[PDB]
Amino acid sequence: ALTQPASVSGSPGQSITISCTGTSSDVGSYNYVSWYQQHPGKAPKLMIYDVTKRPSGVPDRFSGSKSGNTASLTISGLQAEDEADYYCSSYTSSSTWVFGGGTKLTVLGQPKAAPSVTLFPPSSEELQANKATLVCLISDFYPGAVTVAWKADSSPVKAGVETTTPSKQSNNKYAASSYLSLTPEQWKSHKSYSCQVTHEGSTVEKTVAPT
Amino acid sequence: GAEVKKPGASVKVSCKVSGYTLIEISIHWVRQAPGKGLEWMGGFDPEAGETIYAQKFQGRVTMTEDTSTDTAYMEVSSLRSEDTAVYYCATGPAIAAAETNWFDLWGQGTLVTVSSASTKGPSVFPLAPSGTAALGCLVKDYFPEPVTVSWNSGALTSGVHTFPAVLQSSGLYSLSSVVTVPSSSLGTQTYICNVNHKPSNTKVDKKVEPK
Amino acid sequence: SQCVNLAYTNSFTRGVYYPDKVFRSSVLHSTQDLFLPFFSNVTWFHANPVLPFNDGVYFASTEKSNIIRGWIFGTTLDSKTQSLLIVNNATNVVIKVCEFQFCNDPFLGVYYHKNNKSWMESEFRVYSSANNCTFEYVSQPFLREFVFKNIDGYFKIYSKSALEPLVDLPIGINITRFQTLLALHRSYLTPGDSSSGWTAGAAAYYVGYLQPRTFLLKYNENGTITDAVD
């Protein structure tokens, strides 16, 4: 896999760069780096190929470069239509292609907002069904990129976690939800469970206890 | 067209390429799971003269071509729920003497859903509240989309946030619907969420009530 | 089908071939044959038109690449009548007579074959149909100047003054018009390439017409050395 930043934002007219850190097996040894643009619900569009070249139709505001094992896409004069997901891609010494994780690109249209986080413990009705669900609801954050981590007491939890992709609200901010599936014995055994949301490098945590 | 498949079956996606013929073009296949990023499955390497597969897919994916009809095929076998994705064919150069390598997606892809779930109505649990307060309903384990949630038979609309559903590992969906209300009204105003699941003809009314 | 939908004048004292005779001689010999006038109006073409054949043609071209591959000869150039088709590979010449449903703008399409590492030519794009084939000739391929004449059912060819006889062919068909056969290529090398963008270097050819004129041919030991007309 190639490494891209999860998200990047900028104001209209400004410049931004998205980096694509590979290894000697792909970006370091070949000039075959492609960049793809994806608007919601539409097929990725080739923006850059062979590190620097643009297909006919792509504006010159998009440019590519490579240094060492790191490829970069730079967009000058941000337009509202440039807000999309960007993926880099590189040829590999195994004669295969690999993709980066994707970079969400937001063209800022309102002040950045921190997410509101509400955590619901398992209801008594659900516990009597031999099931336990923790509901973490995340709302009103901009730009629309977050990460969720659960903690049982102080230890990370990954098993039993389901998180949704962010979705635009009516007020143009974003919302998401995360669910932790526990057994009633696991739930009552610990002193607390926590939902941690990370947005713009800052973290908002909520905690619930069986007692 | 879209394909629905039980786990363990196989699917064969088609791609009809006009313009240049298949013999003078490299064919690639990429897929993208709903909400996730792009994954390269395999493609024709110009320098190798044949099709190379990502090691994750060797033995379970087979690509073939019908030079008569100019249709590219790819067949995935023993498919599991992680194979739910949109499958894109892509066209790239085949001449190894030139020093360009890339793939350009062809059409808008075909969706392929793998699920063992069948029509099931939701079980509804109250999310009891703890200046204002959040309360709601947990609409749990239903299939397929969509469910509709309203409060107080439509009388209550302000402060209502119905979150998009999560697709859990079991192949079922769950969502939450939260209303933000004054904390003073918690003992006086009645809050009922109305759940309607047309695909299973299920309707649930449940009063959400302080713990 | 596969068909795709895609002057200056000069003069010089060439266009002399052995006088339709293969007799050896060492002196001057007169001849009444079909010859090219010495200072005649030759047409300088850039490429591509269907040209009349008349009684013969002088053809010459200095084209550097392998773009001009041959010619098509016939009358209607349709499926209604038989036509002649000469094609030059890098390794072979191929001469066939069939009822060719020729394309409006014929060309020998060159394309890349990914499963053979090689470029190949397609005789599609030249004709959409080819039935009733009565003649097929295959041998080594043919400034490059040619003389073509079609007399007594035979199609005679001289190449390289003093154009040596190349070959003559029991075609037995009527020939009134002809067209030069060009090789065009296409490659998918940029994400915006167009499949319709067939291209090649600039190609140009000289065309003259043969006339019934008495000549005088000077032989020394083998080749014709000098020549004369008035």
Author numbering:
A (entry chain L): 3 to 213
B (entry chain H): 8 to 137, 144 to 224
C (entry chain A): 13 to 18, 27 to 67, 81 to 175, 189 to 206, 221 to 290
Please give sentences taken from the publication describing this entry.
SARS-CoV-2 variants could induce immune escape by mutations on the receptor-binding domain (RBD) and N-terminal domain (NTD). Among 86 potent NAbs identified by high-throughput single-cell VDJ sequencing of peripheral blood mononuclear cells from vaccinees and convalescents, near half anti-RBD NAbs showed major neutralization reductions against the K417N/E484K/N501Y mutation combination, with E484K being the dominant cause.
On the other hand, all 6 anti-NTD NAbs have lost the neutralization ability against 501Y.V2 carrying 242–244Δ, suggesting that the epitopes inducing neutralization on the NTD are much less diverse than those on the RBD, which is consistent with previous observation of NTD supersite. To reveal the molecular mechanism of these NAbs, we characterized their specific interactions with NTD. Since N5 is involved in interacting with all the NTD NAbs characterized to date, the 501Y.V2 would inevitably evade most NTD-elicited antibody responses. The NTD-targeting NAbs aim at a common region on NTD and can be easily escaped by the SARS-CoV-2 variants containing the 242–244Δ mutation, such as 501Y.V2, since deletion of these residues would disrupt the structural integrity of this antigenic supersite.
